Design an enzyme around this catalytic site. Structure first.
Site, PDB file in Angstrom:
ATOM      1  N   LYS A  25      -1.367  -8.524  -1.911  1.00 59.76           N
ATOM      2  CA  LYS A  25      -0.002  -8.200  -1.528  1.00 59.76           C
ATOM      3  C   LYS A  25       0.332  -6.762  -1.913  1.00 59.76           C
ATOM      4  CE  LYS A  25       4.611  -9.110  -1.571  1.00 59.76           C
ATOM      5  NZ  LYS A  25       5.445  -9.158  -0.345  1.00 59.76           N
ATOM      6  N   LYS A  52      -3.439  -3.028  -6.430  1.00 57.12           N
ATOM      7  CA  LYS A  52      -4.815  -2.951  -5.923  1.00 57.12           C
ATOM      8  C   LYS A  52      -5.377  -1.595  -6.311  1.00 57.12           C
ATOM      9  CE  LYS A  52      -2.840  -4.676  -1.941  1.00 57.12           C
ATOM     10  NZ  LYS A  52      -2.271  -3.348  -1.614  1.00 57.12           N
ATOM     11  N   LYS A  79      -1.727   6.438   3.069  1.00 58.59           N
ATOM     12  CA  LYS A  79      -0.953   7.158   2.068  1.00 58.59           C
ATOM     13  C   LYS A  79      -1.817   8.053   1.187  1.00 58.59           C
ATOM     14  CE  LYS A  79       2.199   4.760   0.020  1.00 58.59           C
ATOM     15  NZ  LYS A  79       1.738   4.042  -1.194  1.00 58.59           N
ATOM     16  N   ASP A  90      -0.910  -5.143   3.678  1.00 58.51           N
ATOM     17  CA  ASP A  90      -0.357  -6.002   4.719  1.00 58.51           C
ATOM     18  C   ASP A  90      -1.407  -6.375   5.761  1.00 58.51           C
ATOM     19  OD1 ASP A  90       1.569  -4.974   3.107  1.00 58.51           O
ATOM     20  OD2 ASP A  90       2.998  -4.500   4.689  1.00 58.51           O
TER      21      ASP A  90
END
Ligand code: ADP
Ligand code: ADP
Ligand code: ICS
Ligand code: CLF
Ligand code: SF4
Ligand code: 0BE
Ligand code: 0BE
Ligand code: FE
Ligand code: MG
Ligand code: MG
Lengths: 522, 472, 271, 270
Positions: free
Chosen positions: C10, C15, C41, C129
């Site tokens: 999630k 992570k 990112k 996601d």
């Protein structure tokens, strides 16, 4: 070998013995072809009803479709406005294909640009592509308007055309007042007709949405005509001529007849004719808006009724006798002008030809395909002629259109043997014409390959093709013909009766076998 | 030379600044190392009517499409396939719908739900339906379109699984249109597809009986039967043509190709990758040949024979002697109607330089030539052929080509369909150099006669003298 | 010998942080660990390469024209402990297509042979996601062979873990990728130990380790370092090396069993 | 009608904060509707008291198109009459969810959805805005008020800055503005150290702050919204406070995205 007196092209050069031997050696040595008997058995199996049942259970494979993608129709609609550049935000190979398709159909130069998005533009977006392309296009080709459509790549990644165009205007790439209408034309929904509709709705929105405070209905005493996706120039011409003979003021929105029919006089005219921006701006002031092809003009109809407050008439396409009369009567009601004697005379002339050719036309069985409105108009006209449509196919059709065509068929005793198919392609139609053989097909050039297959089953199984539709590639200048109105009805009538007579003459040309019916007078 | 430079500057003075610098580097005056003169294989400037296609056009339409016993799936929306169905005249022999599928359009016909939820399941079901309805097909290729590349559908896994399950070769080609800048990357991707999935299937098989006279025609797509018109000559010389790539070609010929003795490559731009791969892996020598016009045909035939023993050279001399009177008669008939005329060309990646010798054989001069997607090596090759103080354009636009033609005023223009009618309305004879104006073949001695007759009927047609109304 | 692993979970579960901390712990133990960031990112390599991760595959791909022109040395930068790091990069939010960027970067890395050096570990760090097939590219064939899902208590973490297992199932059947375990990144919650232990058993996987929430992580991230490089002495640096060893010794590789989340909601009621 | 968009870092607590916010605006007098924008649809679970399993995308696939999708089959009521439409998409690692967002928002535009008597339409977007489709809620005629939800942790603030960079183009091209910065907590040292600093450096404000109240997680377990589970608690009072600030928010400046160097210096500055 070549003789300088009679040079042979590919046909019949490759029928010489040396070339036949070469091909035989190649096939026998290195191609690993199946035995000819196996090929014959498989071909025979493809013509059977069992193969038709296998073919009609397809849910994932499409073979030989009868439609194109939305940006093609968007470009065709964009070409109908004066000094307008079709600009397809997306990849280049698409605009290359659009231009190739339209040059082959029209044998005419077709103008369309792309911003040529690459992998970097897919990853990062096409805003800079938007800016550079708009600036380059306006500087180079000097249009009065740029009509923006999209290729699928752009649609998938969600490129905001409105934001990109506004950013272009704000950063000085193009003048703020320069008109840049846009429309999202995703190729994964609908077909080319949907793209035409979306582009027209975008242009109408751009020119009318924000300036409706000063519009009143019926002030300019005109009728708006929206032709839709139309690839017969005679259709625009006959609509304009019929309205002008009537004395009715009209505004043909998206009229590409001039740009697609420029004269060859030593200079290249990139822009010709087209609807003007003043006409688009004044469009809400008309008495009413008539949609010639209502079955792919849904978004336009919603916009016109909702915004312009025009009570759009429920009119079928003005094809055949009855629907041309209903169109003329509705226009007479809206405008108040009576139908002139010239139109009555031309209707009577069409009726005269109908009674002249009814004997040869009666009972003939036709398969046909094309766009929804065109297909339903052809069905209606064939029903009026005593002919029997049998296989009615529209790949880009919907259930409401199918219900309407079923209602049209059920109202005539010549529609009992007629089945309407939607979502089916030309391989389905090949199966249909093999299993329930009609006399003729009516459709675009892609049907020629069906004819070949039928002729391979035998001369008696052959189904001749009649080229009415888009695109027509293997014949010249058929795009100049007419399908709408009484004039289009007479042209279609003549083509049908003479195709039947030519086939009958072909089947009775055999000396001492079938020439007893080779009659001088038919 | 100065006039050409002045015209280039005048034409360039219409594009915006960035566009102007970018377009300045793709126009040059020929001086018989192209990198120091002209740059190619670059991104097209947006909104300028480029002529180039996409990688899908260069993979499906060019390389894989002519393969006749295979079924090629245009994976994605319906447009690409529809517009590319039967648009290219890659001739073949077969029974369409039974054992040949060149003129057919197979597609997944992607909908909105396919994009949102993926199309791998639909791809597997489509493969199953294809196998059911077209049993005599000898293979499947899956040509990706733009959404397939965007959404990351794992077509390679589907190809592997279905090839295992139904025991047939399925070649996944990642030729999504937005890749690259033109059809060149499509050619490249298709070539690695052949290398990875088809070329090496018979690597461990020694059943084929090979002769010292084994040659493979590489990069001939049989436009109007062109490859056939070449193959006969090569067979009249005692050589055995094992394979043709890819016009009228079969998957068996491609599989058999690594067994040949020599690879005669016609189109460098589209097949040089597989040619070099085969040279490095199987050790097969390869070389270029040119069959456009009689002089280049004779030179190529002698060069081909020189790679073999004396019997091949004797048969080559006999073939040249046999075909000499025909092309001499064609020259004596059609040259006087053509001497002194000027031609401007704009074709894709190989033909602008190959057809020059045939034009010269009729006494005709090429004053301008250019490419859509050629690389620097192609311009290196074409610099020697082109005359001094001539014009070279890379990825030319509509405006630039129109202005160049307006000022230069050639007698004939040979290019694609998208400008045929443009130049027809300017009163200059135009001859499609992609489809041969639905005529041909042009390769070989037999094709030279058709080339000459077409040149005469187009250049000297009376219609060109009737574009001015007598009253104006 | 090179083990390929991919980190999912999630968004906002940690992570990237947990991945860098381990890579640091593995490097201290001694092994060559490539990091591949599949997040536009460009944030997956900052505690190891320091700086801000600078160069990306997509940006120099755009700078040099197409992806073919660019050379491998440009985007491959070695950092702490010899940890070679690469980031796919991508567009600023709300434009472009990040999945295509990840696809292009992964193909780039294979064709230039970045993985195919004598390495020991490759760690892909994937976005939270996973909305398209591109972000599942690290778990295709010949790609990462082990998958680690980082989760925590509450409901969104286990919800996303279950959904990611649902998505993983297709590639697990299509290839050789397997779920190796669940990493519990504790936030502050209560009974999350039992929650995650029960969830792992329900899915057929294991709880490979439990990471406490400590502010030394924030402190080290502010100064652009892992905890292994910031200060080896501190606690919360111990059970980074701990789960590093546990990952090294891991052998339970399974196909996940997604559960109709009425079952998961019941499990929330019980545990 | 105030169409607003809830953006921010993934997992920072958007649909949680959004759901309790709209529930506090509910039973306050106003009418709201939530629109989610990420395939793993659970942005309306608290209000719906159950996961939907009925989203725009699956129903469109079942019927065949969105043209056959009637509106009443995807819109439902909830706590305080709150309308909720979940739109949905594919399972992870397959398909294209941004196109699903595009199709569902277009469907809500076509079928009369927003033209009711409600006050706020709260779009709630995933943290990973990876394509233009997920930026549909901030297109023209769409949501006009963006509330970036972020916490004091560095990574959340970096995500907020990245989102501001992304929405700069839409703000310049249109009229959607950054209403304010919504602050959740991770029990860090910030809570004014880098939240007010980032807000003022973005030219904006922190519109109220909600800390790490443990009650919210145990209300999430109960399918509940905090004001519906414990209507007399401190978290519920904080949520009426947030609703009140949302009601009277007037600061709507264009975001000014600070550079990476500024963020790195700001981390050490506080
Ligand atoms: N064990 C932990 N203790 C405290 N904070 C943590 C811990 N793990 C992660 N964080 C914080 O959570 C934030 C989000 O982590 P991140 O690496 O962005 O996860 P993801 O990449 O899954 O979003 C980071 O900025 C980090 O400082
Ligand atoms: N104020 C709070 N107090 C306690 N827990 C919270 C609070 N806000 C959010 N959470 C927890 O964090 C999780 C965040 O998940 P979610 O709301 O889906 O974030 P997003 O929508 O940004 O992904 C929720 O499951 C919730 O239990
Ligand atoms: S493959 Fe190429 S554009 Fe080399 S894509 Fe194109 S049948 Fe041209 S100049 Mo059409 S590089 Fe062939 C070509 Fe030449 S299709 Fe044909 S004529 S020799
Ligand atoms: S580069 Fe997509 S359906 Fe195919 S025409 Fe395009 S809108 Fe229409 Fe172009 S041709 Fe195709 S889509 Fe790309 S791969 Fe090349
Ligand atoms: S959902 Fe994935 S594939 Fe679709 S546009 Fe967004 S990033 Fe690209
Ligand atoms: Be993350
Ligand atoms: Be989230
Ligand atoms: Fe013409
Ligand atoms: Mg991360
Ligand atoms: Mg959420």
């Amino acid at each position: 070998s070549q003789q300088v007196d009679k040079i042979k092209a590919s046909y019949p050069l490759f029928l010489d013995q040396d070339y036949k031997d070469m091909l035989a050696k190649k096939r026998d040595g290195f191609e690993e072809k199946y035995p000819q008997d196996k090929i014959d058995e498989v071909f025979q199996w493809t013509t059977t009803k069992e193969y038709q049942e296998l073919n009609f259970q397809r849910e994932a494979l499409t073979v030989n479709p009868a439609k194109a993608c939305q940006p093609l129709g968007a470009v065709l609609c964009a070409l109908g406005f004066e000094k307008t550049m079709p600009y397809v935000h997306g990849s280049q190979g698409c605009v290359a294909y659009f231009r190739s398709y339209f040059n082959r159909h029209f044998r005419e130069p077709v103008s369309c640009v792309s911003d040529s998005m690459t992998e970097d533009a897919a990853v990062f977006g096409g805003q800079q592509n938007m800016k550079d392309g708009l600036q380059n296009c306006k500087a180079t080709y000097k249009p009065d308007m740029i009509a923006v459509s999209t290729t699928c790549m752009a649609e998938v990644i969600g490129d905001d055309l409105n934001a990109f165009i506004n950013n272009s205007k704000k950063e000085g790439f193009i003048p703020d007042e320069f008109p840049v209408p846009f429309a999202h034309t995703p190729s994964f929904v609908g077909s080319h007709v949907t793209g035409w509709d979306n582009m027209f709705e975008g242009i109408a929105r751009y020119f009318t949405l924000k300036s409706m405070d000063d519009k009143v209905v019926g002030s300019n005493k005109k009728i708006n005509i929206v032709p839709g996706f139309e690839t017969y120039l005679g259709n625009f011409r006959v609509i304009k001529r019929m309205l002008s003979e009537m004395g009715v003021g009209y505004s043909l929105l998206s009229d590409p007849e001039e740009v697609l029919d420029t004269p060859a006089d030593g200079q290249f005219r990139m822009y010709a004719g087209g609807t003007t921006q003043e006409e688009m701006k004044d469009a809400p002031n008309a008495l009413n808006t008539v949609l010639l092809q209502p079955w792919h003009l849904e978004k336009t109809k919603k916009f016109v009724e909702g915004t312009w407050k025009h009570e759009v008439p429920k009119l079928n396409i003005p094809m055949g006798l009855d629907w041309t009369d209903e169109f003329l009567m509705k226009v007479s009601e809206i405008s108040g002008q009576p139908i002139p004697a010239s139109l009555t005379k031309e209707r009577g002339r069409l009726v005269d030809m109908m009674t002249d050719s009814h004997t040869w036309l009666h009972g003939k069985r036709f398969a046909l395909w094309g766009d929804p409105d065109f297909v339903m108009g052809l069905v209606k006209f064939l029903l009026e002629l005593g002919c029997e449509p049998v296989h009615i196919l529209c790949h880009n059709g919907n259930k409401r259109w199918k219900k309407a065509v079923d209602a049209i068929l059920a109202a005539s005793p010549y529609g009992k043997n007629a089945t309407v198919y939607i979502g089916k392609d030309l391989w389905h139609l090949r199966s249909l014409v093999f299993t329930d053989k009609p006399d003729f097909m009516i459709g675009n050039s892609y049907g020629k390959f069906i004819q070949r297959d039928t002729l391979h089953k035998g001369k008696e199984f052959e189904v001749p093709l009649i080229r009415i539709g888009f695109p027509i590639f293997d014949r010249h200048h058929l795009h100049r013909s007419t399908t709408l109105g009484y004039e289009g009805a007479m042209q279609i009538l003549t083509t049908l009766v003479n195709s039947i007579l030519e086939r009958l003459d072909e089947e009775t040309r055999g000396m001492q076998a079938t020439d007893y019916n080779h009659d001088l007078v038919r | 030379r100065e006039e050409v430079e002045s015209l280039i500057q005048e034409v360039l003075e219409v594009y915006p600044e960035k566009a102007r610098k970018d377009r300045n580097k793709h126009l040059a005056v020929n001086d018989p190392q192209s990198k120091k003169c002209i740059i190619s294989n670059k991104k097209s400037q947006p909104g300028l009517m480029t002529i180039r296609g996409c990688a899908y056009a260069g993979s499906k339409g060019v390389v894989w499409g002519p393969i006749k016993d295979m079924i090629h799936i245009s994976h994605g929306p319906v447009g690409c396939g529809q517009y590319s169905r039967a648009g290219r005249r890659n001739y073949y022999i077969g029974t369409t719908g039974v054992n040949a599928f060149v003129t057919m359009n197979f597609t997944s016909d992607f909908q909105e739900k396919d994009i949102v939820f993926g199309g791998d399941k639909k791809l597997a079901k489509l493969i199953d339906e294809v196998e059911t309805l077209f049993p005599l097909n000898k293979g499947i290729s899956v040509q990706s379109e733009c959404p397939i590349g965007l959404i990351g559908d794992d077509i390679e896994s589907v190809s592997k699984v279905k090839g295992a399950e139904l025991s047939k070769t399925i070649v996944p080609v990642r030729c999504e249109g937005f890749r690259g800048v033109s059809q060149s990357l499509g050619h490249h991707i298709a070539n690695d597809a052949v290398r990875d999935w088809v070329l090496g299937k018979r690597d461990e098989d020694t059943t084929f009986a090979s002769t010292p006279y084994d040659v493979a025609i590489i990069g001939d797509y049989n436009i109007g039967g062109d490859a056939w018109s070449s193959r006969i000559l090569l067979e009249e010389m005692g050589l055995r043509c094992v394979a043709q790539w890819s016009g009228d070609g079969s998957i068996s010929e491609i599989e058999l190709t690594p067994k040949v003795k020599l690879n005669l490559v016609h189109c460098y731009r589209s097949m040089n990758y597989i040619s070099r791969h085969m040279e490095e892996k199987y050790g097969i020598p390869w070389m270029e040949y040119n069959f456009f016009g009689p002089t280049k045909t004779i030179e190529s035939l002698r060069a081909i024979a020189a790679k073999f023993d004396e019997s091949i050279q004797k048969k080559c001399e006999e073939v040249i002697a046999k075909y000499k009177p025909e092309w001499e008669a064609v020259v004596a008939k059609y040259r006087p109607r053509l001497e002194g005329k000027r031609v401007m060309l704009y074709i894709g990646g190989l033909r602008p330089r190959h057809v020059i010798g045939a034009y010269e054989d009729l006494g005709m001069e090429v004053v301008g030539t250019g490419y859509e997607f050629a690389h620097n090596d192609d311009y290196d090759r074409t610099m020697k052929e082109m005359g001094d103080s001539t014009l070279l354009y890379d990825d030319v636009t509509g405006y630039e080509f129109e202005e160049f033609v307006k000022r230069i005023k050639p007698d004939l223009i040979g290019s694609g369909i998208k400008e045929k009618f443009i130049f027809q309305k300017m009163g200059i004879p135009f001859r499609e150099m992609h489809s041969w104006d639905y005529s041909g073949p042009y390769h070989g001695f037999d094709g030279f006669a058709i080339f000459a007759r077409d040149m005469d009927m187009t250049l000297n047609n009376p219609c060109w003298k009737k574009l001015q109304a007598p009253w104006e | 010998a090179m083990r390929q692993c991919a980190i999912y979970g999630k968004g906002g579960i940690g992570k990237s942080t947990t991945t860098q901390n381990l890579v640091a712990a593995l490097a201290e133990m001694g092994k060559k660990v490539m990091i591949v960031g599949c997040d536009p990112k460009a944030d997956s390599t900052r505690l190891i390469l320091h700086s801000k991760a600078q160069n990306t595959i997509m940006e120099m791909a755009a700078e040099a024209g197409t992806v073919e022109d660019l050379e491998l040395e440009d985007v491959l930068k070695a950092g702490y402990g010899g940890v070679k790091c690469v980031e796919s990069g991508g567009p600023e939010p709300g434009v472009g297509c990040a999945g295509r960027g990840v696809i292009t970067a992964i193909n780039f890395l294979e064709e230039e042979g970045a993985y195919e050096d004598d390495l020991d570990f490759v760690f892909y760090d994937v976005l939270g996601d996973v909305v398209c097939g591109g972000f599942a590219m690290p778990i295709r064939e010949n790609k990462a062979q082990e998958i680690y899902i980082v989760c925590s208590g509450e409901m969104m973490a286990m919800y996303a873990a279950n959904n990611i297992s649902k998505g993983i199932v297709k590639y697990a059947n299509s290839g050789s990728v397997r779920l190796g375990g669940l990493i519990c990144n504790s936030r502050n919650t209560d009974r999350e130990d039992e929650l995650i232990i029960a969830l792992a058993n329900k899915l057929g996987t294991q709880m490979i380790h439990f990471v406490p929430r400590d502010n030394v992580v924030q402190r080290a991230e502010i100064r652009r370092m892992t905890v292994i490089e910031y200060d080896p002495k501190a606690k919360q640096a111990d059970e980074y090396r701990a789960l590093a060893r546990k990952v090294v010794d891991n052998k339970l590789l399974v196909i996940p069993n997604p559960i109709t989340m009425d079952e998961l909601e019941e499990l929330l009621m019980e545990f």
